[PDB]
Amino acid sequence: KLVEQLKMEANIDRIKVSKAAADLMAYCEAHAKEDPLLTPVPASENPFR
Amino acid sequence: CLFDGVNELMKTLQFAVHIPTFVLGLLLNLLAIHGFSTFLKNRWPDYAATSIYMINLAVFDLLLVLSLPFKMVLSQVQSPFPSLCTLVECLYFVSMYGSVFTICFISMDRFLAIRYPLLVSHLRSPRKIFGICCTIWVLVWTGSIPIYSFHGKVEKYMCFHNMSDDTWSAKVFFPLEVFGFLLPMGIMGFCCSRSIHILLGRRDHTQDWVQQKACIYSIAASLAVFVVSFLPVHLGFFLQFLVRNSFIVECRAKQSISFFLQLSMCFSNVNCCLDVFVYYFVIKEFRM
Amino acid sequence: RQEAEQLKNQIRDARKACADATLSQITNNIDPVGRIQMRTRRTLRGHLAKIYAMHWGTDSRLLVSASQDGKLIIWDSYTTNKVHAIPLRSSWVMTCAYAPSGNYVACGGLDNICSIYNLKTREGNVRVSRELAGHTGYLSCCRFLDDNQIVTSSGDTTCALWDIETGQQTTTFTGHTGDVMSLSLAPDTRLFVSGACDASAKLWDVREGMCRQTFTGHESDINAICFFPNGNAFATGSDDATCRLFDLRADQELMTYSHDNIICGITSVSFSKSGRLLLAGYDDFNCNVWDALKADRAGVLAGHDNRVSCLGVTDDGMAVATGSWDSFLKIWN
Amino acid sequence: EDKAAAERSKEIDKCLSREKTYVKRLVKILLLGADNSGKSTFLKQMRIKGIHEYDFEIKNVPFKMVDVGGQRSERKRWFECFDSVTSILFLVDSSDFNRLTESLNDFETIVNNRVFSNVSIILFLNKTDLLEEKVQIVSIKDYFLEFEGDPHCLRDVQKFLVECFRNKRRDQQQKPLYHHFTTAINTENARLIFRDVKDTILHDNLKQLMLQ
Numbered sequence A: 001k002l003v004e005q006l007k008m009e010a011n012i013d014r015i016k017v018s019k020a021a022a023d024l025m026a027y028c029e030a031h032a033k034e035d036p037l038l039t040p041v042p043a044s045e046n047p048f049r
Numbered sequence B: 001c002l003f004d005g006v007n008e009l010m011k012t013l014q015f016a017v018h019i020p021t022f023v024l025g026l027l028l029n030l031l032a033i034h035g036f037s038t039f040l041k042n043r044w045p046d047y048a049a050t051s052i053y054m055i056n057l058a059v060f061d062l063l064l065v066l067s068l069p070f071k072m073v074l075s076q077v078q079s080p081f082p083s084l085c086t087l088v089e090c091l092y093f094v095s096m097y098g099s100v101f102t103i104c105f106i107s108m109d110r111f112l113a114i115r116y117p118l119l120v121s122h123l124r125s126p127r128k129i130f131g132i133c134c135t136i137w138v139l140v141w142t143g144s145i146p147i148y149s150f151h152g153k154v155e156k157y158m159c160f161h162n163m164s165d166d167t168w169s170a171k172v173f174f175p176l177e178v179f180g181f182l183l184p185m186g187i188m189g190f191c192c193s194r195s196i197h198i199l200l201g202r203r204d205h206t207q208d209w210v211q212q213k214a215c216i217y218s219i220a221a222s223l224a225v226f227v228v229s230f231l232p233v234h235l236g237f238f239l240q241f242l243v244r245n246s247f248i249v250e251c252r253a254k255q256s257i258s259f260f261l262q263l264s265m266c267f268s269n270v271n272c273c274l275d276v277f278v279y280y281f282v283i284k285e286f287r288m
Numbered sequence C: 001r002q003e004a005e006q007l008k009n010q011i012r013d014a015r016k017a018c019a020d021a022t023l024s025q026i027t028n029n030i031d032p033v034g035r036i037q038m039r040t041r042r043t044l045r046g047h048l049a050k051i052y053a054m055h056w057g058t059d060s061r062l063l064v065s066a067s068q069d070g071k072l073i074i075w076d077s078y079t080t081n082k083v084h085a086i087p088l089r090s091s092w093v094m095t096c097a098y099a100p101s102g103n104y105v106a107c108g109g110l111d112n113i114c115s116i117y118n119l120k121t122r123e124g125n126v127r128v129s130r131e132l133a134g135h136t137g138y139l140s141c142c143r144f145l146d147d148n149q150i151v152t153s154s155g156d157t158t159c160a161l162w163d164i165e166t167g168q169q170t171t172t173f174t175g176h177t178g179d180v181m182s183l184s185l186a187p188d189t190r191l192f193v194s195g196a197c198d199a200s201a202k203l204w205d206v207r208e209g210m211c212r213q214t215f216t217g218h219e220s221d222i223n224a225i226c227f228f229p230n231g232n233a234f235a236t237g238s239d240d241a242t243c244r245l246f247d248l249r250a251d252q253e254l255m256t257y258s259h260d261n262i263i264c265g266i267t268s269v270s271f272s273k274s275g276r277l278l279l280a281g282y283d284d285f286n287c288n289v290w291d292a293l294k295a296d297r298a299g300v301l302a303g304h305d306n307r308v309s310c311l312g313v314t315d316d317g318m319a320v321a322t323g324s325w326d327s328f329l330k331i332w333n
Numbered sequence D: 001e002d003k004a005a006a007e008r009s010k011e012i013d014k015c016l017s018r019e020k021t022y023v024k025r026l027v028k029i030l031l032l033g034a035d036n037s038g039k040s041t042f043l044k045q046m047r048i049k050g051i052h053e054y055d056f057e058i059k060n061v062p063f064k065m066v067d068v069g070g071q072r073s074e075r076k077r078w079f080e081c082f083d084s085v086t087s088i089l090f091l092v093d094s095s096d097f098n099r100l101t102e103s104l105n106d107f108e109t110i111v112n113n114r115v116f117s118n119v120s121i122i123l124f125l126n127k128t129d130l131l132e133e134k135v136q137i138v139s140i141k142d143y144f145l146e147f148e149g150d151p152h153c154l155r156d157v158q159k160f161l162v163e164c165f166r167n168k169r170r171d172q173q174q175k176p177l178y179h180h181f182t183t184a185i186n187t188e189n190a191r192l193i194f195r196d197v198k199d200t201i202l203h204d205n206l207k208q209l210m211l212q
């Protein structure tokens, strides 16, 4: 069972850590201005403030 | 009769005792207030209820310490200030008996927490302790009504001397002694002895009772100081009372009784320093 | 044994080959977020004991919490009003969940049973909809897939997907050796990931019931886990005071979020809506906000009198709720 | 209308506050013991599916016995969610010598756990009758070489066992340890549990009085 699990785990189309890093960068920057925590929202549009 | 040599020697001893008492009590009580304010600020829900009446005791001792220099000064030079003399006497005696009552309440609280651990573990909160402290303040200031009329309208406002024939009457003396020494002495003795007995009786419940062996000594010390601080004065008061009601007539007896009374009243202001030792310093270290 | 060693070596070598450069080496071109101001907008009071779990609603307004007094409480986060107060049969509750539709809530604990409560009843009271039994150990985490499918992780080293209406396990996820602690669904509802006290996490597909991948690297048990918002990465928090961001595609660790002055374990982790802020609650009485792309402690959420055990972010990203052992829920923005 | 929602929150708060006086007066005791310790007869003589709970009243005080019936095998801190219990009550089969070491090995794991630093230990040595039979048949020295008294005296073996259990406890300055030697009659154990819990609350009060 361990051998089969490791065999199936090894057979995954990995991408470069640089490429996945670029993907995370793209997702973070694309939704950056919709994040009420990166850019706090003024009290006029803040349900808690 | 003759009271000149007794008065001179006693004035010398009043300075000699009160000046170190004043400085040491001021320093120690300021440190104690700082430490217990530190304990309270954190709102540790174990140390708040005890810290409140430790603060109360420290405040009463601090008031007595602040009143001591006025007692030293105004008792040597005549003061054409009836209001200042009355304020000094009020501060002094109110602080002394506030310390007595706070000590008595500390002993009552310890005995209640020890003898009735379930009830006290349920119905004991910092607000009740603060209410009891406020009640102590109200009662001790209510008891100060007799001490605005020591000297009456007599212009010889030599503070802490020649009070009156009314102050030394039975109707003021007996309420002073019973509610000032005898009631707190009985309560203090009962609570402390019973707490010692209960905490020693824990050897039949667990072999870990020795953990609280120190808690024995502290409580025992609470008796020993309270006896030495306040037993000689009120007995002294009693003696002087017997002088002022024409029960004691000899001149040597009168001089000795007056000297003993004044010396005892000087020594009981060392209680403001013995309190930061019996309490305030039997806890872990009382980290400064 | 030799084949297993060869497969592990091949996986690690592929990881190294993919690891040409990490995020901390190429994110220097992004301006750091700075130092984030989060203030206690509300303080939810009413629990009588430690709070062990919370979960936000999908409307970003309702909030369920579980505490050791044997109670779930459903709060309106805007007005502090307690919408519901559900007494539990078992006072030893370790997890709670809130249905994406808002119709149901769930909880579990040392009773080995996942209790599902229906919030939409004609009688107007909360009624125990189901009591999913079948786990052997205590219940550590619980996450709804929909109104009828629920995934529960337990201390019997076994995860499970349950059909709520039937009451029996639809499928069983095995492969962990230690107590399964935390569980996070992918934001597509086809995958999930679990951390199970083996210094390892595993990714499980819901329908096939098979462990696609196993991630390692921690030194202690993993107490918390959550997905990156796009579902392509996930972050774990273990007791070695270390957060770790792993990739689904790279099959390896992407970042380590650790600092010298923090040594206590992590009780909870969460992401922001864009994913740049990784929030983590710690045993040291306060939460820390890490720049998920720089591994820098860009903020601190202090204010609890005890250990922060619960941490959740609203679906719209407006606020962050924390729960701690002092029985107070604090909403931060 | 938000007025109705606020009102409903108020009745919910009233219901929660009505149980505060119960949550504050409730004594939770975590019950541990091996399969041979006689836990079943103990609980039965207390006049009384995951873990179990048992609720009872002694002298207007509510006690809740939490019995982790085999689920304690998950020796993880997350499972160690019992740091709020007043006492841990161990049951040990004192007569069955062959397992005392094992019992001791368990005791040392529980009392020295950092989680239970604020928890007093009540220790019950069940089957004392089977002790007086076992003592006169076999020697306690046959299993423990540290014994020093005469192996055929019940009192000396009893003190040896008590000290063996007490010596597994490091940091003897936190909470008191209580030991009792009980038989299968078990007709007074509620009284002993109440006495030990009252003494633990006394210890907590003394901690709270700043006497040392």
Ligand SMILES: CCCCCCCCCCCCCCCC(=O)OC[C@@H](O)COP(=O)(O)O[C@@H]1[C@H](O)[C@H](O)[C@@H](O)[C@@H](O)[C@@H]1O
Pocket: B003, B007, B093, B094, B097, B098, B139, B140, B141, B142, B143, B144, B146, B147, B160, B161, B162, B163, B164, B167, B176, B179, B180, B237, B240, B244, B258, B261
């Ligand atoms: C419900 C709460 C109860 C308590 C509340 C707190 C309030 C306390 C009330 C205070 C009562 C007054 C105490 C009485 C003694 C005193 O206040 O002080 C003694 C002594 O000072 C007076 O002695 P007195 O006889 O007046 O005069 C002497 C020498 O003073 C001369 O030096 C001279 O040498 C001697 O011959 C002789 O004349």
